[PDB]
Design an enzyme around this catalytic site. Structure first.
Site, PDB file in Angstrom:
ATOM      1  N   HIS A   1      -5.933  27.410  50.453  1.00 22.14           N
ATOM      2  CA  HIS A   1      -4.961  27.556  51.512  1.00 22.14           C
ATOM      3  C   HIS A   1      -4.553  28.972  51.883  1.00 22.14           C
ATOM      4  CE1 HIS A   1      -1.875  27.211  48.143  1.00 22.14           C
ATOM      5  NE2 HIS A   1      -1.238  28.087  48.892  1.00 22.14           N
TER       6      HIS A   1
ATOM      7  N   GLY B   1       4.891  32.835  46.625  1.00 23.98           N
ATOM      8  CA  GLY B   1       3.974  33.924  46.348  1.00 23.98           C
ATOM      9  C   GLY B   1       3.257  33.824  45.000  1.00 23.98           C
TER      10      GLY B   1
ATOM     11  N   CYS C   1       1.285  31.254  44.078  1.00 26.61           N
ATOM     12  CA  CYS C   1       0.015  30.530  44.196  1.00 26.61           C
ATOM     13  C   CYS C   1      -1.097  31.423  43.699  1.00 26.61           C
ATOM     14  CB  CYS C   1      -0.265  30.140  45.653  1.00 26.61           C
ATOM     15  SG  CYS C   1       1.026  29.120  46.366  1.00 26.61           S
TER      16      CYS C   1
END
EC number: 3.4.19.12
Lengths: 300, 301
Positions: free
Chosen positions: A41, A138, A140
């Site tokens: 993503h 942030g 991820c």
């Protein structure tokens, strides 16, 4: 000497963390040899990733390692992950392997932001396929791992937060743990249960450290145990779990079903204001192997 | 979201750990630039510990008496001296992995990350708090002496603790990086005992704030209290007196959640008087005190 929930030293994983930015979206990537893994993503409700990949070219991705920009020379996808080829093989790459863990197993998580490690903590893959982590926006791309000897086994990459505040992600092959999907929908965590196998391992650790007041001279059949434990929302214990506890059972000379009788007494009557390893509650996030490593003094 | 007991990434410290051996004794050492730091009791034998005189013991040793090893590779020590309860060994080679660092003496109630080592090698990392009685509830086995406690601000490492021993109750004692013990302890075998342990009130308040920031707010109430009235109750439950300075430290967290500090003290007061009635906070059935306000802000914010 105490017993502590501990994490594996994180240096070997700290050396592989980079910042990956695609436009407005910044997150973390894992840099091993000349490949950078990050969540799919980054190339951004129900988006057709596969398609948005076309609008993308190598110069679209900005991979930063320390004060240096890693030039991307290849891009591809593997399940919910993005594999960027860079022109520099990471000099800090440690010996490693990608592993998919099973429910109840634990791992250390290196929390990162902007490709920079912020903290490390220990957690467990819950029976419902989520983890009770601690992540801010942030994070991820942050990863979970275990260390065996000198080989780093990566078993988790962080993707999102579920409505109850728990977390979901994938193995390093990009396949999610649980039925979750990296997209917006109304997915929620299933009811969670206590990891019986781990509670039993922790009671063994207590005995090993001299905290043995809760032991008794009785035993129980597996089924009678499960009949009581499930009432307290404990995962059913299986013969295979009993087997995983064999080394601890042997080290203490206490049969697993004999420890299960102590646990059953602990569940029905409580602790009577007592403590086990300083705790007032039965810890379920230490696996039989975590116990062996901490009680023994295993190094890397 | 989520709240976890977390440690600082240990990599910058890992690259500084070495092994130091004298005769049959081996323990950990911290290698920074061209100096190796470790507990001085690596030099005296078993007997000695009955009340060794380290000055007398050290003067009988030579540079070649110390076997320093980074990995299996030996480092040549070309100098040595003692500073309080630590040994400083000068080696003929510099450590390229040495991070930017400083030595700090922390106050009781502060937290720090510990990198448990054995034979100079990394075993695990965990987070703890210097207790009010100056001991720490660590997880250490024989051979862990020399492991260090630290904090990291940016890329600068603050070393604050070096492990030296375990007390009768099984808690741990150590020193700062100048060899000065934390608490009334000595590196000698004796009837020593840990002092009176109290609960770190400032930290329990920071934690209730981290619970609030993450939903959990059942323990809250419509009451408020005065600093004085709070202490009268808390001090009755083995809790450290809360000072106005502490109230000030909790300000940012107060503004962030919109719950005034004294209102939160009221909530705690109520908790201490009525238990949690089988409830839990941040998954805990006890009030946790090993998270400073600084820790909560860093993690929750």
């Amino acid at each position: 000497s105490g017993f502590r929930k501990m994490a594996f030293p994180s240096g070997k994983v700290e050396g592989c963390m980079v910042q990956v930015t695609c436009g407005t979206t910044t997150l973390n990537g894992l840099w091993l040899d000349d490949t950078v893994y990050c969540p799919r993503h980054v190339i951004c409700l129900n988006p057709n990733y596969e398609d948005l990949l076309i609008r993308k070219s190598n110069h679209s991705f900005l991979v930063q390692a320390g004060n240096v920009q890693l030039r991307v020379i290849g891009h591809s996808m593997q399940n919910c992950l993005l594999r960027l080829k860079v022109d520099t093989s990471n000099p800090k790459t440690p010996k490693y392997k990608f592993v998919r863990i099973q429910p109840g197993q634990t791992f250390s998580v290196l929390a990162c932001y902007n490709g920079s490690p912020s903290g490390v903590y220990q957690c467990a893959m819950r029976p419902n396929h989520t983890i009770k982590g601690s992540f801010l926006n942030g994070s991820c791309g942050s990863v979970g791992f275990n260390i065996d000897y000198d080989c780093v086994s990566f078993c988790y990459m962080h993707h999102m937060e579920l409505p109850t505040g728990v977390h979901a992600g994938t193995d390093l092959e990009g396949k999610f743990y649980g039925p979750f999907v990296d997209r917006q929908t109304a997915q929620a965590a299933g009811t969670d249960t206590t990891i019986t196998l781990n509670v039993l391992a922790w009671l063994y650790a207590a005995v090993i450290n001299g905290d043995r007041w809760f032991l008794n001279r009785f035993t129980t059949t597996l089924n009678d145990f499960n009949l009581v434990a499930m009432k307290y929302n404990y995962e059913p214990l299986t013969q295979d779990h009993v087997d995983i506890l064999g080394p601890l059972s042997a080290q203490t000379g206490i049969a697993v079903l004999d420890m299960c009788a102590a646990l059953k007494e602990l569940l029905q009557n409580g602790m009577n204001g007592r403590t086990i390893l300083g705790s007032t509650i039965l810890e379920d996030e230490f696996t039989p192997f975590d116990v062996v490593r901490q009680c023994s003094g295993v190094t890397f």
